[PDB]
């Protein structure tokens, strides 16, 4: 049969809570660390790869940093395998909105669209939820720079500064101690780097194990320069903060 072999995976427990969400959140706390810090001039998304070797290529790796659209990039922490479906759904949604209204998508819409996909899997079907936690960096006209993080339930909350994945509680305290309300991209980069230096299992934080991208108001008056850095520009700001 079928009924025989079913566990029931979408039901409740007496807690009024779903095991498959908690269990997913657990598995994100075993993966690499991801941090977003919002400046008054930009957003820094800085992510650490949970694997490294001296035979790992770094030069075709964008395994945590992915562009969803030219104004919106995300940092990924969780099941990378699961995340890849959601990324390409996210790119397609961005484009759908852009197609019909001929105008760049708000950051609000795009985060909620994903949250509802994830929502569908817990709601019905007897499926497991995709185990990914996203940090979204975006600029839109209405609220300017926007930072958003979403979890496997399908729920999002905006933030001023946030950390997800492993060492969620630790990196966050560091951020409360050194956060200035207003910052420059340079103050954001300086803080971001030092926090991930304070949370890494390796003895020193290296460029070959750092992914780093920004969205900068380095271009002005309605234009933004999106940057995915090469690991040799990551190398160079790592000596500026004096880690190296």
């Amino acid at each position: 049969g079928s009924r025989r072999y079913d566990s029931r995976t979408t039901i409740f427990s007496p807690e009024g809570r779903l095991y498959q969400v908690e269990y997913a959140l657990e598995s994100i706390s075993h993966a690499g660390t991801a941090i977003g810090i919002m400046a008054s001039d930009g957003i820094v998304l800085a992510a650490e790869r949970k694997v490294t070797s001296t035979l790992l290529e770094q030069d075709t790796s964008t395994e945590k940093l992915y562009k969803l659209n030219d104004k919106i990039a995300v940092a990924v922490a969780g099941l990378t395998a699961d995340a890849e479906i959601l990324i390409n759904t996210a790119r397609i949604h961005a484009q759908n909105y852009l197609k019909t209204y001929n105008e760049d998508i708000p950051v609000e819409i795009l985060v909620r669209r994903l949250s509802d996909i994830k929502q569908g899997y817990t709601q019905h079907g007897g499926l497991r939820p995709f185990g990914v936690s996203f940090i979204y960096a975006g600029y839109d006209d209405r609220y300017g720079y926007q930072l958003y993080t979403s979890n496997p339930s399908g729920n999002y909350t905006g933030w001023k500064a946030i950390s997800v994945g492993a060492n969620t509680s630790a990196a966050q305290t560091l951020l409360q101690m050194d956060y200035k309300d207003d910052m420059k991209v340079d103050d954001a980069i300086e803080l971001a780097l030092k926090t991930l230096s304070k949370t890494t299992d390796s003895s020193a934080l290296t460029y070959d194990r750092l992914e780093f991208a920004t969205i900068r108001k380095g271009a002005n008056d309605g234009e933004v320069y999106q940057k995915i850095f090469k690991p040799q520009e990551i190398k160079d700001i790592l000596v500026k903060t004096g880690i190296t």
Binding site: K99, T100, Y101, N102, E103, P106, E108, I109, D141, R142
Partner: protein, 195 residues
């Protein structure tokens, strides 16, 4: 088709729609409007096919307002215009044809400029400083080009538009019993009862 004219004044779009409605060979009604306010700052007037017009006009108010209440902010006239275009575009390919010619006029308070658009039945969006569809269009396009200036005050736009009304009446074999006037401006969407 009947009267449906736009003129892009410096700060506002002045749209006007026919009162007369003839379905069959007898005018049945003669105070009817052909316009439905989409959003606080975008008005849409329509003419085209009978009965297609009334239904499809209710359809766009519904959908654009659906999205308005989702985001607690209102779409730009450029963005609403594109939605209306999108739909009619699918409709000439689709089984049942719609046939609705629209002037969408709005005041965007975020570009701070009045915007006027003409969407024909085929599905072509075009930004214009004055516009028109159908039968009326043939006499007025040239009449408005003559006297226009780039920047004209609101009450100048009314006076001009009443020259265009007045002309039309002589020349058209059809009878339209004067227009209804609406101004769409930065200070809201009002009517003028002066014809």
């Amino acid at each position: 088709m009947d009267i449906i004219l736009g003129i892009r004044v410096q700060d506002s779009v002045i749209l006007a729609s026919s009162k007369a409605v003839t379905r069959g060979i007898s005018v049945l009604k003669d105070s009817d409007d052909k316009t439905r306010q989409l959003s606080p700052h975008t008005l849409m007037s329509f003419a085209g096919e009978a009965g297609d017009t009334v239904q499809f006009a209710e359809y766009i108010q519904a959908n654009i307002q659906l999205y308005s209440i989702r985001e607690d902010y209102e779409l730009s006239p450029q963005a609403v215009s594109s939605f209306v275009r999108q739909e009619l575009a699918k409709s000439i390919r689709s089984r049942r044809p719609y046939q609705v010619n629209v002037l969408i006029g709005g005041y965007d308070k975020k570009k701070n400029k009045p915007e006027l658009y003409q969407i024909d039945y085929l599905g072509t969006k075009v930004e214009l400083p004055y516009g028109a569809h159908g039968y009326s269009g043939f006499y007025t396009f040239s009449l408005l080009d003559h006297h226009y200036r780039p920047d004209m005050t609101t009450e100048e736009g009314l006076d001009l538009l009443k020259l265009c009304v007045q002309e039309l009446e002589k020349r058209m074999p059809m009878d339209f019993k004067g227009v209804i006037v609406k101004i769409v401006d930065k200070d809201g969407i009002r009517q003028v009862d002066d014809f």
